[PDB]
Structures are given as structure tokens and as C-alpha cells.
Design a protein around this nucleic acid. Structure first.
Length: 351
DNA sequence: CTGCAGGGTTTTTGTACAGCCAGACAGTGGAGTACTACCACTGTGTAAGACAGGCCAGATC
């Protein structure tokens, strides 16, 4: 456990509070640029490199067959691991564009070719969903399961704008939790089914979901109806058996009370959770370790690194997982005159 | 019940005697009155982003 400050070298104004780090093939790719894509980088996606403290961002370039992506702020990222057919995929869905509307379109991102000289080409394919599509939402979670042997995706949670009946230009910008029904989406084709279960009373948002061996564990979300941060741990068990993806669920005793956590994989299935917030006012400071197996989730409090007074007295903080026991955290910075660099950056490393 | 029509009711609308004050009219000689034009000149316009060229640094045979 260690932390080092990073110097936000030029072009650090493209990092916004909500954003994603897609970790694929060595270097990781920042995504969710602030504002619309400026023609300095007409794609919108960036490759990030951390070297001797310098955080340098390079402009990736799409391939010829790709449809282009609007910089969603807080979408649902699902890492589809390397296997047949085209490894490895990242499922982005659905978030909200730089104009405040919700996308409701599933995108699949893959790698194409390299280099020559330290260059990587990507490709984004928008994939149609026939249904019974899930309603446009943001903050939810999507997870990838492999069940004998078909790959499916489980989609759950997330806020949404009010339905188009009570929607009023005085209550326009208000959000309410989407109804709690789990959507099972096939990677191919776009046939999506929707199931409901009694144990899931209300939906959640910003809840870290972990998925392994046809089982999905949901940690504590933030329910906006009762304003509670439930410490219940949720588990659901699905199996795709022709012709239904039959789904069941169970409640567990203890689940951590964190919302919007930074889940970095370190081991085979062991994760380190950095956490966003314990309560509405007081953010989480402790770092936790969550291993998981067929038995269940195993929790362990590990020693958190000594925080600088700044990151300890920060009101809000965000970030993502660079992977391999490394994570990136950001602190909004106050000063006059404008720094102008708004976000000061830290790199945290496990072992 | 409706409609209109002589007259009633009380109330207005005005003209009628008849005496009498308050302000406009004329004016003036000019004053100071009061209202207009003329004169240069002001403020609100206020930061990043696109593109072409040169070059260097790291990866490859």
C-alpha cells in the first residue's frame, strides 16, 4: 500500500467527476471526456500513461468500421473477458451525453491492430437490442456471466428521469430510481428478457457489482426512496437453460455500506475496494479487501496508506482502477487565481 | 305567467327670482422666468481552439 502524487501535465481539463477507465491490453484508456469531442482528438477516447509521476494522455483513433461514441458521463461498464469470438470486449451502456439526456444504447468496444510506433487502434460497434429493451438509465451495473456455456449479461439498478407523465418543467432535472427488475441481455443477438423477483424491493444506484462463475454479488447501494445506504449484501444466481435464463436470489448478512467504490482487481478473483462514501456527508477513508469464491464473499480490512491532509479533508473524491493493484484517485482543488488545473491526482498501489 | 299603459312613488335636472365674490382680461416694461438646443464623449461588447510545419525519439530489420 502506497500513494504518490502525479503532476497533471497538459491536457488535464478533459477529466470530469464522472468518467471511466477501460483497462485493456496493457495501457488503459480514459473515457468520458468533458464536453463534446474537440477536434484535437476527434474520437473522444484517450490512452493514459504514467511514467515518473507524469500522467500523459495520448489521442487514440478509431478504425474504419466503427460508429462513434458520445462522451457518456457515468455509464455501466462491463468487462467481457477474452474468449470467442473477438477478444476482449468492453460493454458500455448507457450513461448520459454532454446534453442532459440518457443514451439507452449498448456499445461494444474492441481492439483492432498495432502499432506501428506505439499506436493502438480501437473499434466501437453499436449493437441493437430487440425487446423489451431496458429503459434509459445511468449509474446502474452490468455484469458478465458464463453459464454452460453461453455468455449472458445481467443488468440491474440505476436512476432515471421521471416518466413522461409527471415530468414537469419545474421537476425536469429531478431523478428517481428505476423500477427494480433484472434484465438478462444476450451479447448476440440483442434479445433481452426482463424478470422480476420479490426479494428485490427497490432498485439501487452506484453499487459495485462483482460477477464470477454464474453468480453475482451486489454490495451496498444508495436507495433514494428511504435515503438509506443498506448494509445488506445481495446475491443472485442465474443459469441459461433452454429456453429460459432462470434466475434466483438471496440476501446475505453483511455487506459494506459504500456507494461508488473503486474496485481494483489484484489477484485472480481478489479485489481491493477503495470506496466512495459511508454516508451522505462523511466519505469513506478505510480501504478494504474483498476476495470471492464459490463459498461466498470474504472480507478483510487491510491497512490503508497514510493519507495527506488534503485527501483526508476532501469533501468529495472519485477515480477508477488502472488495474494490477494500481488505482487512480482525483481530488478537486480550490484556489484563486484559477490553477487552472482543477483536479490534483494521486496513484495508489497495492503491494 | 307574459306584454303594455294610465298613473303613482321618490328622486333628479334645470330654470327660474335676486344679490355678490373670485378670478380672467389688457397692458407694460422688463425680469427672471423656464425650457430647450449644442457639445464632444461613455458603456455594454473580452480566450481557447483549429491547423500547418519542423523535428525528435523510440521501435524495427
Amino acid at each position: 500500500m502506497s500513494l504518490q502524487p502525479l503532476t497533471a501535465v497538459n491536457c488535464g481539463s478533459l477529466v470530469q467527476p464522472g468518467f471511466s477507465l477501460l483497462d485493456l491490453e496493457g495501457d488503459v484508456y480514459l473515457f468520458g471526456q468533458k464536453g463534446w469531442p474537440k477536434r484535437s482528438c476527434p474520437t473522444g477516447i484517450f490512452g493514459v500513461r504514467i511514467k515518473k509521476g507524469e500522467l500523459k494522455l495520448r489521442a487514440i483513433s478509431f478504425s474504419n468500421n466503427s460508429s462513434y461514441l458520445p462522451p457518456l458521463r457515468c455509464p455501466a461498464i462491463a468487462h467481457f473477458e477474452a474468449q470467442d469470438g473477438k477478444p476482449e470486449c468492453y460493454l458500455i451502456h448507457g450513461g448520459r451525453t454532454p446534453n442532459n439526456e440518457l443514451s439507452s444504447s449498448l456499445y461494444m468496444l474492441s481492439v483492432d491492430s498495432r502499432g506501428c510506433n506505439r499506436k493502438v487502434t480501437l473499434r466501437c460497434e453499436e449493437k441493437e437490442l430487440v425487446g423489451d429493451v431496458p429503459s434509459a438509465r445511468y449509474g446502474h451495473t452490468l455484469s458478465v456471466i458464463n453459464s454452460r456455456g453461453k455468455t449472458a449479461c445481467v443488468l440491474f439498478g440505476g436512476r432515471s428521469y421521471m416518466p413522461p407523465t409527471e415530468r414537469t418543467t419545474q421537476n425536469w432535472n429531478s431523478v428517481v430510481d428505476c423500477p427494480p427488475q433484472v434484465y438478462l441481455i444476450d451479447l448476440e443477438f440483442g434479445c433481452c428478457t426482463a424478470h422480476t423477483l420479490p426479494e428485490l424491493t427497490d432498485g439501487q444506484s452506484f453499487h459495485v457489482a462483482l460477477a464470477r462463475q454464474d453468480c453475482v454479488y451486489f454490495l451496498g447501494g444508495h436507495i433514494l426512496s428511504s435515503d438509506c445506504r443498506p448494509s445488506r449484501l445481495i446475491r443472485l444466481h442465474v443459469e441459461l437453460l433452454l429456453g429460459s435464463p432462470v434466475l434466483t436470489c438471496t440476501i446475505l448478512h453483511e455487506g459494506l455500506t459504500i456507494t461508488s467504490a473503486i474496485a481494483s482487481p489484484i489477484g485472480y478473483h481478489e479485489y481491493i475496494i477503495f470506496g466512495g462514501y459511508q454516508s451522505e456527508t462523511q466519505k469513506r477513508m478505510e480501504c478494504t479487501y474483498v476476495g470471492l469464491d464459490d463459498v461466498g464473499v470474504h472480507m478483510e480490512s487491510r491497512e490503508p496508506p497514510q493519507w495527506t491532509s488534503e485527501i483526508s479533508h476532501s469533501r468529495t473524491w472519485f477515480g477508477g482502477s488502472l488495474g494490477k493493484g494500481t488505482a487512480l484517485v482525483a481530488i478537486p482543488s480550490e484556489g484563486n487565481p484559477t490553477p487552472p488545473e482543477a483536479y490534483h491526482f494521486y496513484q495508489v498501489s497495492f503491494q
